[PDB]
């Protein structure tokens, strides 16, 4: 293969391969490091979709992680 | 390629293609129909993770949907 990696496996802000991908209540995907900064800043809104967060969720990771593994196995490349 | 559709794309319980995918606060993937039946039964918990639900969030679909589209485009077939 040796082709550009899919955008879904790279966070928009990161613009590179993510290490600890997670999902927010809004359903958007952000890097663990990034979300920590966001929480630290005291932000309670989602800038990507531009909507407020009136609730929290436990959703960490799931299908995306599984799909990444399948992709990695096909390419024979270890995960981040 | 694409000999067989990904397990992730298929519902874990039904094991079939879904038209209205949703994710619980536990980040578990369930079919809209399945969730309605579960709710009708009076159950408000996550059996896969074995934990109760005390809140809700807006997480119907996101990256997962995007990955499906790429998969379908590769096969040149319309979405389920």
From Swiss-Prot, chains A, B:
Signal peptide: none annotated. Residues 4-78 form the U-box domain. Possesses E3 ubiquitin-protein ligase in vitro. This is U-box domain-containing protein 12. It comes from Oryza sativa subsp. japonica (Rice). The chain holds residues 227 to 303 of 611 of the full protein.
């Amino acid at each position: 293969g040796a082709m550009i990696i899919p955008d879904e496996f790279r966070c928009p802000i990161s613009l590179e391969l993510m290490q600890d991908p997670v999902i927010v209540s809004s359903g958007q995907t952000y890097e663990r490091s990034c979300i920590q900064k966001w929480l630290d800043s005291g932000h309670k809104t989602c800038p990507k979709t531009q909507q407020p967060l009136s609730h929290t969720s436990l959703t960490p990771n799931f299908v995306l992680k599984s799909l990444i593994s399948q992709w990695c196995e096909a390419n024979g490349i270890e995960l981040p």
